[PDB]
Design a protein around this ligand. Structure first.
Ligand SMILES: [Ca+2]
Ligand SMILES: [Ca+2]
Lengths: 794, 794
């Protein structure tokens, strides 16, 4: 049993139900003259889209059952005038892909449905109720995660409408009435206003367009644009990641690198003419959601922008030029910027197939650039679905004055990520020209990123999208995994605090995954919600999308099929609590420790000697392995007697002294207890079990499940440079053996500690997987009488 | 660097090269009047299939390079009359998907190609040599594993031929000139001669047909038939696996269960008429090879047979009825047996689209049924590619009188596997009728499989295909993973010894995988070999397939891109060696131990107490973890001073006494040493990086790579029941504390122990992952003076 929760079902009255059923050729136009048996047989047989003649459909009826002693065929032969509730759903559950005995009992089909959160109609005693039961059924999530109508679509139900060259809606959502055999996958070259490769010419960027062939027949469609720096190819460079096994250095060496923009060379203007594209796409959609929506009439557009394959320029990680080159594609889609058929710039081509409404899609670098482009208020951008996104690039490689890696990306920085996406180097003819420009940018990025001091700067400030949040004009969806330690959740939290204040409509989805999607889960119909959303925002159809579901949806960390509905994500969801350490290694609301406890950090010496992995170190560390926990102070609460939900950003105050005139402190909150927590990533339940359309590719149904027992889980943590004790934006010299007050915030969370578990505050320094790993020892002393951890709880 | 070894390239003379290039519209019909520059530009531009106009192709030429200082476009502008070798392959390597600097240097492109086993022409000094260099290039394996021509195919190169309704060959292989947008995926119902569900009627079996639409225009095509008991759905029943935590029992309780065949009800005969199918397929191809060949004109046919969804009957695991129902599909394909459009049996439909030549495909249960069907000599079956196959069902759940599981399938048996594939239960209307018949078969299988005694029987003998090997008339390819501990390699070895003797053509492929495919590897062009093979065997085209590559190809366990070419797989590949234990725990060709060493087997008591996994136990066991190695005797050789390759089936003799009047002995050979062995499964290198055709789905390029260091690897092992000391087919009572001589064979292998490693013989009893796990202790005493291990080495 798992709850296939459904939030995207729009309440529909019977007249509108009838209208939609007739429109999709499911219900006869004159349904009122049809008797009950004739109706029920036709509606079941129409759902059985794999049988193509009426004879074939009829033979299929023997394979369904209304009870443990009667097939559907034999039921129909009795000339029935109604159908009991259990009888109908003994048929329905099979249409939904459930199996009798193994999933449900003949005796209790609606009991089963109730426990998988599937709706059912209690009363089906006439033609009207039977039609409404079948309308709800078509809108019912099947075992493979998709509503029954999409299973019918996978069986080709909607190919009968192909060639009608128009959108068609069902329960407010676009359905697959487009000839996906004829879908157009072409390539153009948009002209930016940039000259990042210093050749005196506007940088052209290769742009991949997937559009329904129906656009060749006058239908204008919206576009879902994905700004993907990876789209042209990904250069592996992990061996070039900067060494992190180095001692800390004096941050007062900071001299505040400055941001300087690239040369501008303004592009020509569009002149009205257009010739069709002359190149077919070779790169594929990187998110099944886009292909799903493409089968349903929405074009998808993909571009790497400057520095990527078949494009001019260099990557400049996080810079305004990455925003501008990426936004240039929307300007072309809205008909304001020029594009060409090839890189000779001789023949202009337009996005005249586009209805002028653009939304964005994609995660990570792709969701990062949606935040960036949104702040420019570019005309045409109506909505973003920003997934797993960086909202400020300092927050991806730094924190509180210190150099802090993404998980499994030790030593990565702006210069590494620039090369990673510098895929025009793969064109060896362009390599001759681009290689020197790429080298110059490598030197500038390596210098300005300032790994020596870890400090913020005017340079880093250029990559802080949150300081232009006032520019956002589009509606807003953010998606983020609560356990994403790659793009850490601080990014989405801090942009949400700004965006939630703004007049446009906004939602937030937080799932239990790490750097990972949530479009194909058992527990939430995210794809159907986005369908409803994109139809409202990009087709201007009034389908209740602005009233359909809650602002914030937060997947529960104890039950994967529980989704919390909240008005916000902020400390304001809970109430303030403060825990104080004790001299006995405890953590209590009335704690009153007074000792000065010390720990000797041994940098990366012992970690690199032991040869263990970074994730092995982290787990043994938070579990309190003696060998790895020795460089730390641990404070445990007593076992919780009721579950408690920590919400928002915990804030630590800590008075500390260091043996050297420099250093860093890390602070973590850990849940203690041996139990089966959720799997790190969703478990695959039906591999390629979802149809994106008719013969249009698949996705995999999955969901988090109880894992092998673990003894602990990291809730949240953060790091801080000692020399920033006074100012997050300005370092200061410090004396060894003098106490300083650090006050800083941890990563945002939404985490239910279950009863019977303990909460551990850990104070330490070197994080083998995310800080620098010094080659020297350093002793820290913490004044327990001036240390505390404060967080909000619900 | 990895060797993309190529065995499928057929030597072609220049006249035949020219003929094929013209035929695929790559070379102009009057190529002799074209000057060098005009030729080279056209041939490069034709390879660039993603650009669709000549203008677009021309602009692409600037993106390639002939040297570190000249693009291809600028080279062409110099009016060249030849091209140097390094200049050509600086272009070619980019067409092959390699990247300059990151993969190869401008200075040494053919050096790079040499080290990836890519061919290159040393001399390109005129139009003739340039055409031959381009012919070889089109036939050159690209970085994604596919020959360049298939990359062009992915780019739609061959859609220009769609609608010509005929096969087209290139280098002896079928190429994708079929309209895969119009491919036909339909369903019929073949009528068997069986009544396994006791309803008085022939069992019908649902059959899924994928055929090129070109068959509607009179083209007859061959069929690749996959007998898949899973095709209708897979019922999970792992929790029902029989308990293996039980004490051994007296095998003389054996009373020799007998095999009895199901009722026969002969099917009607075909009468000439045929109407087209009325049902579309809902299940997908389960092997990318089939879809690849389907884009190239070969229909693929899939059927679960009796007991599966939309079919009558019950599964009877391994029985003749599973062979007969599966063979019924070939008889329909050859036009000898009837089929209907639906299960009313009212309308006949034929396989008149089929040219009468059938081959089989698929692994595991699917490759098992190919061996079974082959022994019947069914008319139409021309060749099998039998992968990961059982050749005798006793050898899947038993060995030497003992109950021996497949890896991770403890407690599985015939009755479990029957239910697993009993997918017509998913049709709840048929469940009413089938459930009682399934229950009766469960009782009969559970009883006759005789898990109590572990013995062979007349019943088991019914599932021994090797005793009907004389019936095989088809040519033969076997594929098996040397590390498959699910379908253990004994199965393929023993059928190979019979098949290799027969007059028809035969090959064998042994890879380093476990229960896993090898159609998409870096190191071998298996897919292209099968293309050449299927064209020779099913289209009757003389394309050198019978002379193209060696009989046996064996992937090396030390270098994943080394494939051994051998005439056989047998002890005859090496020379006999015998090692004898010592009283000091050593193993030497001149060993001379004389003690009686004992070990106390503690069944599953300690294993189940420790809660560790079965694979954890196995690794710690073969490494010699004190806690788990105590119930065993270990004998180590000294380190090897030269690599040695063990070949064939090692044979152990061992004199043993047991503390109880029953028992079992296990014997393993283990390679000792801490080093990076190959990954358990291939590492994904280009996820979905292979195109099956044009817009026709993908496969993933992969290859075994060095893994994290391990301290040991299992080479081979086997088990034996003490009471079978006299007869493998007949148990005997035994006295406790009396010595018996066991003489038996281990699993077949082909394993190079590297110099510096040791060879360990382990004698033990309870294998926590594959034998019964007794609840009592039992002490074994081994007479070292009458114990030895003999194997052949090369
Ligand atoms: Ca430029
Ligand atoms: Ca029957």
């Amino acid at each position: 049993h798992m709850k296939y929760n459904q939030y995207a079902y729009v309440e529909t009255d019977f007249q509108q139900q009838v209208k939609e059923l007739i429109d999709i050729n499911f219900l006869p136009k004159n349904y009122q003259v049809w008797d009950f048996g004739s109706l029920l047989a036709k509606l079941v047989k129409n759902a059985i889209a794999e049988a193509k003649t009426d004879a074939a459909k009829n033979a299929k009826l023997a394979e369904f059952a209304v009870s443990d002693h009667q097939t559907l065929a034999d039921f129909l032969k009795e000339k029935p005038t109604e159908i009991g509730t259990k009888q109908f759903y003994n048929v329905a559950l099979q249409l939904l892909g459930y199996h009798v005995h193994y999933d449900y009992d003949f005796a209790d089909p609606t009991g089963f449905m109730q426990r998988n959160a599937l709706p059912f109609l209690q009363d089906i005693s006439d033609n009207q109720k039977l039609i409404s039961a079948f309308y709800r059924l078509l809108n019912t999530r099947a075992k493979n995660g998709q509503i029954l109508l999409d299973v019918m679509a996978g069986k080709g139900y909607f190919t009968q409408f192909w060639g009608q060259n128009k959108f068609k809606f069902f329960n407010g959502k676009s359905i697959p009435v487009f000839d996906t055999n004829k879908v157009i996958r072409e390539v153009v070259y948009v002209e930016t206003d940039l000259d990042t490769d210093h050749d005196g010419k506007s940088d052209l960027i290769q742009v991949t367009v997937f559009r329904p062939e129906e656009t060749n027949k006058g239908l204008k469609v919206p576009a879902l644009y994905t700004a993907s720096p990876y789209f042209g190819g990904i250069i592996a460079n992990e061996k070039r990641n900067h060494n992190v096994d180095e001692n800390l250095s004096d941050s007062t060496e900071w001299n505040d690198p400055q941001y300087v923009h690239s040369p501008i060379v303004k592009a020509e203007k569009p002149d009205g003419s257009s010739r069709p594209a002359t190149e077919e796409a070779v790169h594929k959609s990187s998110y099944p959601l886009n292909e799903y929506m493409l089968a349903r009439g929405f074009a998808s557009v993909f571009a790497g922008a400057i520095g990527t394959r078949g494009s001019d320029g260099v990557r400049i990680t996080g810079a305004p030029e990455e925003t501008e080159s990426a936004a240039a594609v929307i300007e072309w889609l809205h008909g304001d910027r020029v594009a060409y058929t090839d890189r000779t710039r001789t023949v202009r081509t337009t996005a005249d197939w586009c209805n002028g409404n653009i939304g964005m899609t994609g995660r990570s670098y792709l969701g990062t650039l949606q935040i960036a482009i949104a702040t420019t208020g570019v005309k045409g951008l109506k909505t973003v679905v920003s997934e797993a996104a960086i909202s400020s690039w300092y927050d991806y490689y730094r924190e509180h004055g210190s150099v802090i890696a993404p998980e499994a990306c030790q030593g990565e920085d702006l210069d590494l990520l620039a090369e990673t996406c510098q895929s025009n180097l793969w064109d060896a003819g362009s390599y001759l020209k681009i290689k020197p420009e790429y080298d110059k940018m490598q030197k500038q990025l390596r210098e300005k990123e300032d790994r020596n001091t870890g400090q913020y700067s005017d340079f880093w400030e250029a990559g802080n999208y949150r300081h232009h949040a006032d520019g956002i004009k589009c509606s807003w969806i953010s998606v983020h995994g609560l356990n994403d330690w790659n793009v850490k959740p601080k990014n989405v939290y801090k942009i949400w605090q700004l965006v939630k204040k703004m007049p446009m409509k906004h939602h937030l989805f937080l799932h239990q995954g790490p750097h990972y999607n949530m479009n194909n889960l058992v527990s939430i119909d995210f794809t159907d919600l986005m369908n409803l959303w994109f139809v409202h925002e990009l087709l201007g159809i009034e389908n209740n999308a602005y009233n359909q579901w809650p602002t914030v949806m937060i997947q529960d960390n104890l039950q994967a099929d529980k989704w919390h509905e909240e008005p916000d994500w902020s400390n304001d969801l809970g109430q303030e609590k403060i825990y104080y350490p004790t001299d006995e290694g405890e953590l209590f609301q009335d704690g009153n420790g007074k000792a000065q406890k010390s720990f000797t950090d041994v940098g990366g010496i012992e970690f690199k000697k032991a040869g263990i992995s970074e994730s092995d170190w982290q787990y043994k560390f938070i579990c309190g392995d003696e060998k790895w926990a020795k460089p730390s102070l641990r404070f445990e609460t007593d076992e919780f007697t009721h579950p408690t939900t920590i919400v928002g950003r915990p804030e630590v105050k800590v008075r500390v002294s260091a043996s050297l005139p420099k250093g860093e402190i890390s602070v973590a909150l850990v849940e203690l207890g041996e139990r089966q927590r959720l799997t790190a990533t969703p478990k695959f339940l039906m591999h390629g079990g979802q149809e994106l359309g008719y013969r249009f590719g698949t996705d995999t149904l999955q969901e988090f499940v109880p894992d092998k027992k673990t003894k602990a889980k990291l809730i949240t943590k953060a790091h801080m440079n000692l020399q920033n004790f006074k100012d997050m934006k300005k370092p200061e010299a410090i004396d060894a053996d003098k106490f300083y007050d650090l006050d800083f915030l941890l990563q945002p969370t939404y985490y239910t500690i279950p009863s019977g578990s303990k909460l551990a505050l850990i104070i330490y320094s070197t994080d083998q997987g995310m800080t620098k790993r010094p080659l020297e020892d350093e002793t820290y002393t913490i004044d327990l009488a001036n240390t505390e951890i404060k967080f909000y709880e619900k």
